[PDB]
Design a protein around this ligand. Structure first.
Ligand SMILES: CCC[C@H](NC(=O)[C@@H](NS(=O)(=O)c1cc(Cl)cc(Cl)c1)[C@@H](C)CC)C(=O)NO
Ligand SMILES: [Zn+2]
Length: 398
């Protein structure tokens, strides 16, 4: 992924090290472009939501291990540079896998759809899928992006994948897609069990959120109000459809196949409606690109087919393979296979601890092995992820 190594200090160039302004809906922040369509903001997320940046906790917090609230985290350049280094390692670690390489490839190629004009012959960018990059003269220049890795808000361990919405349009649920703003930190991780056994490889945590940027970027995300089945332990919580697709594994069986049938067709007709909009396109808004460059971008995104007229169609086959890839190949469970790590086997493993970590030094954690370093004691029984055995790399907190 990252071609050049970046330092937070590194001078702004208005190209890949810039001060930037998020769709609001305010002050500029230093952000790094670590790859086409992917920016990292080494700041706490006090921007995406309305004044949801006070860092200070509210009334009664869920406390460790369900919440953490240090107001001071990601305040210092030294932390910010470590943060960037931290996300610049997990990406690569992710890229090193044939699956992560494909996923990231999916994310990069998944340009949000230029669905912003009221007139149905017109291709126009949705400004919410842009950032403003500050130029030498203090002027801003609309830029198109796919995914932003930003710092956590107040609750530091509240990692999520979110997106700006539309007055009418459900951009994550209509095949259009939307710029993603994942709120994440590689400076902490969750402990699970099966005495405090082990710890999550943050690579997996980040892989989870990217499986989200995936579905939301391709506009195939299940509505958050679709929860599921009651196969209770021998009085219990329920899990989101979306979250069950994404973790994968055994639990990705609890899902009514004829609700998956019923979606796999919903996002086919959505894709088809995209193919129509493009065919019916006579104008494009902007200086940037032609109606033909942008029609090929999206031909490329939605794996559309181009006849001799140059009319686009959705191949039911290419679609099924893409849908299978994003929805059921790209899963936390299948990542843990590739990473050769230990992870919660389900979503009902109440992480009983948040640990302080530093994945930056190649003595602590590396791209190839994570914590479980080869030619060390750690490379067996995931003794690298053991909170006990490897107490230096895992310091439980409050
Ligand atoms: C970022 C990677 C995963 C991610 N997990 C979560 O946010 C939760 N993690 S969890 O659901 O796995 C969870 C499970 C249990 Cl039993 C207990 C807790 Cl604290 C967290 C909590 C942080 C919620 C606030 C996710 O799916 N976001 O869409
Ligand atoms: Zn999730």
């Amino acid at each position: 992924f990252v071609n050049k190594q970046f330092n937070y200090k590194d001078p702004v160039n208005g190209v890949d090290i810039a001060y930037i302004k998020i769709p609001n809906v305010m002050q500029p922040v230093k952000a790094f472009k670590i790859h086409n369509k992917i920016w990292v903001i080494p700041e706490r997320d006090t921007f995406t939501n309305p004044e949801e940046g006070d860092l200070n906790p509210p009334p009664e917090a869920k406390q460790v291990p369900v919440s953490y609230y240090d107001s001071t985290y990601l305040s210092t350049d030294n932390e910010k540079d470590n943060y960037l280094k931290g996300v610049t390692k997990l990406f690569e670690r992710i890229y090193s896998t044939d699956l992560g390489r494909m996923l990231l490839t999916s994310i990069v190629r998944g340009i949000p759809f230029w669905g912003g004009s009221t007139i149905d012959t017109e291709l126009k960018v949705i400004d919410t899928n842009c950032i403003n990059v500050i130029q030498p003269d203090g002027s801003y220049r609309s830029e198109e992006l796919n995914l932003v890795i930003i710092g956590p808000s107040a609750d530091i361990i509240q990692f999520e994948c979110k997106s700006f919405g539309h007055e009418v349009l459900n951009l994550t649920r209509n095949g259009y897609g939307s710029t993603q703003y994942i709120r994440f930190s590689p400076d902490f991780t969750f402990g699970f069990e099966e005495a405090g056994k082990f710890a999550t490889d943050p690579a997996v945590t980040l892989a989870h959120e990217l499986i989200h940027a995936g579905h939301r970027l391709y506009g195939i995300a299940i509505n958050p109000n679709r929860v599921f089945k009651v196969n209770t332990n021998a009085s219990g919580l329920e899990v989101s459809f979306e979250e069950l697709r994404t973790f994968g594994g055994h639990d990705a069986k609890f899902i009514d196949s004829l609700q998956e049938n019923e979606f796999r067709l919903y996002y086919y007709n959505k894709f088809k409606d995209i193919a129509s909009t493009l065919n019916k396109a006579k104008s494009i808004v902007g200086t940037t690109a032609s109606l033909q460059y942008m029609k090929n971008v999206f031909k490329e995104k939605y794996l559309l087919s181009e006849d001799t007229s140059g009319k686009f169609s959705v191949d039911k086959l290419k679609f099924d393979k893409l849908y299978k890839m994003l929805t059921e190949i790209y899963t936390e469970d299948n990542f843990v296979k590739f990473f050769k790590v230990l992870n919660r086997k389900t979503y009902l493993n109440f992480d009983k601890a948040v640990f302080k970590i530093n994945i930056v030094p190649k003595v602590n954690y590396t791209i190839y092995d994570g914590f479980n370093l080869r030619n060390t004691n750690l490379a067996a029984n995931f003794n690298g992820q053991n909170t006990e055995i490897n107490n230096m790399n895992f310091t439980k907190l409050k």
